[PDB]
């Protein structure tokens, strides 16, 4: 099939900023691409069609450029209502595929994340399933890297992430990584840890705990 | 551009519009223009419709519009029929009101059109004789 | 011109899912439209399953799901159905019915999108929520701030409201959205950051309210004394 | 600077003209020979027209006359292959039926015995049947004869087909268009702000009624009064109301149909012995719903006159049985109900079911055509009919002393009014694709 490429994923921008979003394709698309804006809890809305014509009912601040395999969305003057997810969709041939997404938020000072780890209780262990929670609070930018380590070895799988919407008071964020495992798998190991790397952290933060202590 | 849907104005949908707006909805009306008692009545209705379309086609055929929807004519438009500005007769008047305004001069216009086309063909024949 | 989706919000796994989208045709317009179905998961990019025409009905399906998707339509009652047999846990997403048609009378694209309906594939039913206390570690008392919370696990369906100190405490309270687990039940967590000097002197109680099952849970959060 | 005339083709121009409308149906023996109509379009197109105020008018469109002529032709074509019931006009020795007869139904039925022909011409048979009092007359144990004996003889309704009024769509041929008025508060005659061009009429039920319109189209939002001239005393009044009232009609006589061979392949269906109890056929209507409907009709009619005048409803004026009583059809049986119990109330400014008896008439002459009657054969079993009233046909009485105490009586002889409350929205026009709008072009001269 056709893969749709788009950059970047999340970036910081202030009100009235001159920002561009890049989008690439695996094959030749020429000019059959459209840009969409989707808000949380709302359906996507068309902004620019055919990569050069402005859709009716949309502000003139949005613009599009590029051809062939390269496409770029440009904003002339950013506004607070433009803070939403942006997608790039091709229409040259089937199948129809979208981009990775681009989230824009209000730019502010960089704050280090407050990483904490919550060990499972005895009732949770006796219930049959445990869930280790690694929490991050008051961090900016949106991008961050959280990984799970078991017995000093990096592991993947059985992990979920829950991220809340942007705070309207201090413009911060809250991150919560949940590692759901069984009682046998939890009792089979002894050392558990979550490591977080952020721009505001000069060293990788590692939160570890043991079952015995 | 693979899932683009095309929709046009409906049959007689441009009746309340202006002259210029309804001027681009002629093709749809042109294409949409076309136990013994029931069969003979429906057959007579279809034959009457075909004869009416044939008469209209012949009316446009005797003039210099043998096939084309939009066509001009060298004869001028006298102000005795309708002395209105072009800026408002094409943007502030529908086809119904305009047709009801000069409905008494349609026969005169048709007669002058047919004689003008006849003399035009005679002039073209005389010009080709050189 | 508006579009709307309809169907069961909660469906059982392994059976065929059916959705109905009502169309509001443009007044005084004749031609052909292009109806399509696009689903979008929580925190994931949207995915297009298939599309079809209104006059010819040429159905185009995605190769990754052509063996389960089926798009049908009818002009008798002017409706189009979407069928997806053998639904899995990954099918839990928000479905949207779109209609693409360019009006030659106004030269506009008319890209209208429906509000979408949330479809969840699970085998669980309505039950009470499980609350677990996420108390801070004893070695974290050296820091100026400590985070404590309550975890909601093994509950269905939405929604639940978590409050701290009967709703009086609102500074630093963060309630993360529910995420569907692998077992087919939702789960979330509510945290709050408070200074370490308040530990041992203030009683922190989290209250969880569940409207579909009408369950009220109150739990006290305190550090593990050794 | 001068202008030049240019001829255009395919322009939207309308002219009031009369054409022949062809029937259409879903094409699902059939009823009223619906196979003559072409199949209808499963997706009828509706084109709403904006910025248009086309004039609409009733009592003048040729669609109602075309529908009347089409119904007459369909009726004649349906009754033509049926057996001609001409030789039963003989001396019918009739006696009264006293088999558990009630006081009100006494004298309505008559057991008549007569000599009827059989398959063999040289032999006759003494047969007995039951005939209503409305179908027999005395000639001076007594002798009686049918009412249509001194009038032209007629056929009988074949049991293979029924009188079910299936919906029919009237579509115009090429070169014509049908415009409908989508205004909810549309007047009887005047311009319509919401005109819509449609392929052809919607499901039209060819119901037959003389006093109360039933099984028709409901109103948009409130009661409406329609008439060609409200101040005219001789002009009929058509009232349409949005919330219908249900009527339950029953024929408790469990009569048995009997087949009599009256010749080669000719079978006369007569009424045999009525088993069980016997009772007069009657209809029931809800008292509360009828009172609410009457109040809404009175409130809607009070705006057309003074607010201080009072209005009284009276029964039928008189005349023949076709207009003095409500005549309709249910399960192949014809009912004649006395509606005097409904129009018996006055209206001054500012357990609960009404029952009305009905009579059954076999010798029916529909369409008010002298001669060409139709013998309705009896239907086995108890006839149960359920219907919704969608309108009424009122008539103001003469005199009108000091414009007070207006008395309204039901009526309506012609059947055209029965469809005037259904085809009022619809109209047919002829499209003119010729236009001579001028511009500044001159054409390439040779
Ligand atoms: C106004 O609208 C109402 C609708 O509410 C009409 O009422 C209908 O009247 C017809 C007859 O005029 C009724 O049809 C008869 O139904 C009898 C009961 O059968 C029931 O079950 C069958 C099988 O499921 C259904 O098809 C049927 O609809 C009923 O639900 C039948 O015994 C009758 O059979 C007769 O016709 C058949 C051919 O179809 C013959 O073969 C038989 O021998 C027999 O002669 C008949 O089908 C209908 O039921 C009524 N509707 C309702 C809801 O009760 C009014 O007639 C209509 N017009 C007026 C003026 O009021
Ligand atoms: C096109 O021809 C028709 C038909 O001749 C014209 O209609 C006619 O218009 C005149 C007025 O222009 C009408 O006269 C009216 O008479 C009454 C009674 O005397 C008077 O009260 C009015 O004030 C008015 O004068 C006439 O009735 C009417 N119809 C006929 C059959 O003559 C129409 O005006 C012509 N249009 C143009 C643009 O020439
Ligand atoms: C009916 O009339 C309205 C009013 O003119 C038309 O709507 C548009 O109105 C704006 C008002 O400024 C005009 O500038 C536009 O030119 C109008 N549109 C067009 C296409 O002319 C409306 O389009 C008309 N509709 C019909 C069916 O005639
Ligand atoms: C049916 O036919 C019989 C036979 O002709 C009729 O009976 C005759 O009636 C007349 C008049 O009363 C008598 O003079 C004859 O003597 C009768 N003949 C026989 C053989 O009985 C009878 O009247 C006819 N009509 C009916 C209704 O039965
Ligand atoms: C509707 O009917 C009334 C009946 O009252 C008609 O009224 C007549 O009006 C003329 C006006 O010149 C009078 O000379 C008559 O005397 C009136 N009739 C009566 C009986 O008094 C009215 O014209 C009719 N409206 C129409 C036909 O449009
Ligand atoms: C109508 O009258 C006829 C006689 O003219 C009745 O026919 C006979 O009636 C007797 C007594 O009721 C029965 O025993 C016979 O079986 C009947 N048939 C014949 C052929 O003799 C008939 O029953 C009467 N019908 C009614 C409804 O009273
Ligand atoms: C191909 O057809 C679509 C309509 O289905 C149209 O929108 C598109 O512009 C066409 N492509 C070209 C190159 O003409
Ligand atoms: C027509 O145009 C002339 C100028 O050419 C102008 O003076 C006049 O007012 C116009 N009339 C109308 C009705 O627009
Ligand atoms: C029979 O009924 C008629 C009415 O149809 C009546 O005039 C007559 O008196 C009745 N005769 C008997 C004997 O009941
Ligand atoms: C037929 O007889 C009835 C009853 O006597 C009578 O009312 C009617 O006028 C007669 N018709 C003719 C045409 O003689
Ligand atoms: C309906 O039309 C008649 C005649 O034009 C008029 O007298 C009457 O007032 C109109 N009624 C309404 C409700 O417009
Ligand atoms: C009418 O008579 C028939 C005779 O068999 C019987 O089956 C039927 O039940 C009767 N109906 C009523 C309503 O009595
Ligand atoms: C009509 O109402 C009367 C009131 O007593 C009742 O006896 C009769 O059975 C009713 N008939 C129907 C068909 O409801
Ligand atoms: C008529 O019969 C129906 C049968 O369900 C009943 O619901 C309705 O109330 C009846 N109406 C009257 C006026 O008897
Ligand atoms: C209708 O209801 C009103 C309610 O007050 C009552 O006064 C009136 O007599 C009723 N009319 C009939 C005909 O039942
Ligand atoms: C009659 O009453 C209605 C409703 O209040 C009002 O609109 C109308 O003007 C009144 N007419 C007269 C003549 O008082
Ligand atoms: C019904 O109308 C007739 C005239 O057709 C009349 O003689 C009779 O008295 C009326 N009945 C009632 C109850 O008003
Ligand atoms: C209806 O029945 C009443 C009962 O008193 C009667 O007076 C009236 O004349 C009847 N109607 C007709 C039109 O005969
Ligand atoms: C009409 O109402 C009057 C009021 O007393 C009553 O005497 C008469 O019998 C009623 N007539 C009918 C047919 O209901
Ligand atoms: C009568 O009205 C009811 C309620 O709207 C409806 O369900 C029923 O189909 C109607 N029957 C007829 C024959 O119109």
From TrEMBL, chain B:
Coiled-coil ranges from the UniProt annotation: 100-130
Disulfide bridges in this chain: 65-71
Domain of life: Viruses
Transmembrane region(s): 1-24
Membrane-topology descriptor: Single-pass type I membrane protein
Residue segments, region Immunosuppression: 41-59
Residues carrying sugar: 78, 85, 104
Cell compartments where the protein resides: Virion membrane; Host cell membrane; Host endosome membrane
Annotated region described as Fusion peptide, given as residue ranges: 1-21
Protein name: Transmembrane protein gp41
Organism expressing this protein natively: Human immunodeficiency virus type 1
Lineage of the species this protein comes from: Viruses, Riboviria, Pararnavirae, Artverviricota, Revtraviricetes
Covered residues, full protein: 509 to 660 of 860
TrEMBL record, chain D:
Gene Ontology cellular-component annotations: host cell endosome membrane; host cell plasma membrane; membrane; viral envelope; virion membrane
The keyword Transmembrane is assigned to this record: yes
Disulfide topology: 23-37, 82-158, 89-149, 94-112, 171-200, 181-192, 249-283, 283-337, 283-358, 330-385, 337-358
Post-translational modification: Highly glycosylated by host. The high number of glycan on the protein is reffered to as 'glycan shield' because it contributes to hide protein sequence from adaptive immune system. Specific enzymatic cleavages in vivo yield mature proteins. Envelope glycoproteins are synthesized as a inactive precursor that is heavily N-glycosylated and processed likely by host cell furin in the Golgi to yield the mature SU and TM proteins. The cleavage site between SU and TM requires the minimal sequence [KR]-X-[KR]-R. About 2 of the 9 disulfide bonds of gp41 are reduced by P4HB/PDI, following binding to CD4 receptor.
Domain Human immunodeficiency virus 1 envelope glycoprotein Gp120, residue spans: 3-103, 107-446
Region feature (CD4-binding loop): 316-326
Main location, first listed in the record: host cell
Single GO term (MF): structural molecule activity
Chain segments carrying region V5: 401-411
Domain notes per entry: The membrane proximal external region (MPER) present in gp41 is a tryptophan-rich region recognized by the antibodies 2F5, Z13, and 4E10. MPER seems to play a role in fusion.
Function as written in the Swiss-Prot or TrEMBL entry: Transmembrane protein gp41: Acts as a class I viral fusion protein. Under the current model, the protein has at least 3 conformational states: pre-fusion native state, pre-hairpin intermediate state, and post-fusion hairpin state. During fusion of viral and target intracellular membranes, the coiled coil regions (heptad repeats) assume a trimer-of-hairpins structure, positioning the fusion peptide in close proximity to the C-terminal region of the ectodomain. The formation of this structure appears to drive apposition and subsequent fusion of viral and target cell membranes. Surface protein gp120: Attaches the virus to the host lymphoid cell by binding to the primary receptor CD4. This interaction induces a structural rearrangement creating a high affinity binding site for a chemokine coreceptor like CXCR4 and/or CCR5. Acts as a ligand for CD209/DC-SIGN and CLEC4M/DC-SIGNR, which are respectively found on dendritic cells (DCs), and on endothelial cells of liver sinusoids and lymph node sinuses. These interactions allow capture of viral particles at mucosal surfaces by these cells and subsequent transmission to permissive cells.
Protein name as catalogued: Envelope glycoprotein gp160
Species this chain originates from: Human immunodeficiency virus type 1
Residues of the full protein shown: 31 to 503 of 860
């Amino acid at each position: 099939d056709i893969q749709m490429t788009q950059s970047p994923s999340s970036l910081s921008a202030s009100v009235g900023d001159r920002v561009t979003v890049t989008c690439r394709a695996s094959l030749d698309i020429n000019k059959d691409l459209n840009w969409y804006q989707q808000k949380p809890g709302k359906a996507p809305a068309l902004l620019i069609y055919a990569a050069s014509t402005l859709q009716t009912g949309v502000s003139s601040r949005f613009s599009g450029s590029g051809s062939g395999t390269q496409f770029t969305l440009t904003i002339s003057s950013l506004q607070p209502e433009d803070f939403a997810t942006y997608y790039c969709l091709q229409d040259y041939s089937f199948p129809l595929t979208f981009g990775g997404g681009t989230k824009i938020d209000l730019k502010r000072t960089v704050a280090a994340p407050s990483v904490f780890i919550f060990p499972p209780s005895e009732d949770q262990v006796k219930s049959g399933t445990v869930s280790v929670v690694c929490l991050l609070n008051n961090f900016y930018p949106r991008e961050a890297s959280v990984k799970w380590k078991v017995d000093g070895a990096l592991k993947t799988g059985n992990s979920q992430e829950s991220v809340t919407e942007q705070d309207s008071k201090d413009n911060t964020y809250s991150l919560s990584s949940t590692l759901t495992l069984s009682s046998t798998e939890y009792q089979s190991h002894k050392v558990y840890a979550c490591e977080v790397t952020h721009q505001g952290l000069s060293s990788p933060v590692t939160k570890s705990f043991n079952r015995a202590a | 551009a693979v899932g683009i849907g095309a929709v046009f104005l409906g049959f007689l949908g441009a009746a309340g519009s202006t002259m210029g707006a309804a001027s681009m909805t002629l093709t749809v009306q042109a294409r949409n223009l076309l136990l013994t008692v029931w069969g003979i009545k429906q057959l007579q209705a279809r034959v009457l419709a075909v004869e009416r379309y044939l008469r209209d086609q012949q009316l446009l055929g005797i003039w210099g519009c043998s096939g084309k929807l939009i066509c001009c004519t060298n004869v001028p438009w006298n102000s005795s029929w309708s002395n209105r500005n072009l800026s408002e007769i094409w943007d502030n008047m529908t086809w119904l009101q305009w047709d009801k305004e000069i409905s008494n001069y349609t026969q005169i216009i048709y007669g002058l059109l047919e004689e003008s086309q006849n003399q035009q063909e005679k002039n073209e024949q005389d010009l080709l004789a050189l | 011109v508006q579009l709307q989706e309809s169907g069961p919000g909660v469906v059982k796994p392994s059976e065929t899912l059916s959705l109905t989208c009502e169309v509001s045709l443009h007044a005084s317009r004749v031609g052909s439209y292009y109806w399509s179905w696009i689903r979008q998961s929580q925190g994931q990019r949207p995915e297009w399953m298939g599309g079809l025409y209104s006059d010819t009905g040429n159905t185009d399906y995605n190769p990754s799901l052509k063996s389960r998707v089926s798009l049908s339509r009818d002009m008798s009652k002017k409706q189009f159905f979407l069928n997806l047999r053998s639904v899995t846990a990954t099918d839990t997403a928000v479905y949207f019915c779109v209609s693409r048609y360019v009006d030659h009378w106004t030269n506009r694209r008319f890209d209208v999108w429906g509000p979408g309906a949330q479809v969840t594939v699970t085998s669980a039913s309505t039950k009470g929520p499980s609350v677990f206390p996420l108390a801070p570690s004893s070695r974290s008392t050296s820091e100026s701030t400590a985070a404590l919370g309550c975890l909601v696990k093994d509950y269905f369906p939405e929604p639940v409201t978590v409050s701290w100190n009967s709703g009086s405490l609102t500074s630093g309270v963060h309630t993360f959205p529910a995420v569907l687990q692998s077992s087919g039940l939702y789960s979330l967590s509510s945290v709050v950051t408070v200074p370490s000097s308040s530990l041992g002197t203030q009683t922190y109680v989290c209250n969880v309210n569940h409207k579909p099952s009408n369950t009220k849970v109150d739990k006290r959060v305190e550090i593990k004394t050794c | 600077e001068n202008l030049w005339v240019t001829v255009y083709y395919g322009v939207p121009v309308w002219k009031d003209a009369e054409t022949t409308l062809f029937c259409a149906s879903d094409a699902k023996h059939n009823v009223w020979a619906t196979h003559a109509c072409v199949p209808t379009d499963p997706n009828p197109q509706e084109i709403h027209l904006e910025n248009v105020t086309e004039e609409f008018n009733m009592w003048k469109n040729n669609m109602v006359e075309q529908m009347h002529t089409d119904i007459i032709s369909l009726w004649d074509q349906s009754l033509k292959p049926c057996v001609k019931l001409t030789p039963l006009c003989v001396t019918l020795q009739c006696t009264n039926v006293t088999n558990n007869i009630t006081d009100d139904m006494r004298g309505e039925l008559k057991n008549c015995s007569f000599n009827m022909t059989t398959e063999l011409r040289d032999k006759k048979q003494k047969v007995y049947s039951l005939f209503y009092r409305l179908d027999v007359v005395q000639i001076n144990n007594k002798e009686y004869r049918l009412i249509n004996c001194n009038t032209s003889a007629c056929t009988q309704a074949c049991p293979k087909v029924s009188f079910e009024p299936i919906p029919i769509h009237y579509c115009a041929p090429a070169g014509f268009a049908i415009l409908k008025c989508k205004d909810k508060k549309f007047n009887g005659t005047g311009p319509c702000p919401s005109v819509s061009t449609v392929q052809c009429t919607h499901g039209i039920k060819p119901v037959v009624s003389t006093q109360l319109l039933l099984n028709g189209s409901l109103a948009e939002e409130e009661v409406m009064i329609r008439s060609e001239n409200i101040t005219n005393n001789a002009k009929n009044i058509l009232v349409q109301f949005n919330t219908p009232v249900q009527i339950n009609c029953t024929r408790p006589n469990n009569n048995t149909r009997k087949s009599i061979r009256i010749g080669p392949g000719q079978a006369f269906y007569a009424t045999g012995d009525i088993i069980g109890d016997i009772r007069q056929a009657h209809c029931n209507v809800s008292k509360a719903t009828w009172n609410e409907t009457l109040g809404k009709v009175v409130k809607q009619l009070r705006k057309h006159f003074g607010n201080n005048t009072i209005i009284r409803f009276a029964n039928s004026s008189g005349g023949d049985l076709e207009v003095t009583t409500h005549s309709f059809n249910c399960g192949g049986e014809f009912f004649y109900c006395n509606t005097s119990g409904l129009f018996n109330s006055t209206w001054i400014s500012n357990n609960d079911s009404i029952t009305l008896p009905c009579r059954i008439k076999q010798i029916i002459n529909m369409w008010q055509r002298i001669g060409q009657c139709m013998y309705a054969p009896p239907i086995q079993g108890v006839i149960r009919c359920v219907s919704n009233i969608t309108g009424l046909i009122l008539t103001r009485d003469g005199g009108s002393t000091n414009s007070t105490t207006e008395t309204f009586r039901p009526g309506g002889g012609d059947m055209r009014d029965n469809w005037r409350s259904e085809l009022y929205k619809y109209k047919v026009v002829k499209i003119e694709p010729l236009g001579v709008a001028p511009t500044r072009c001159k054409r390439r001269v040779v």
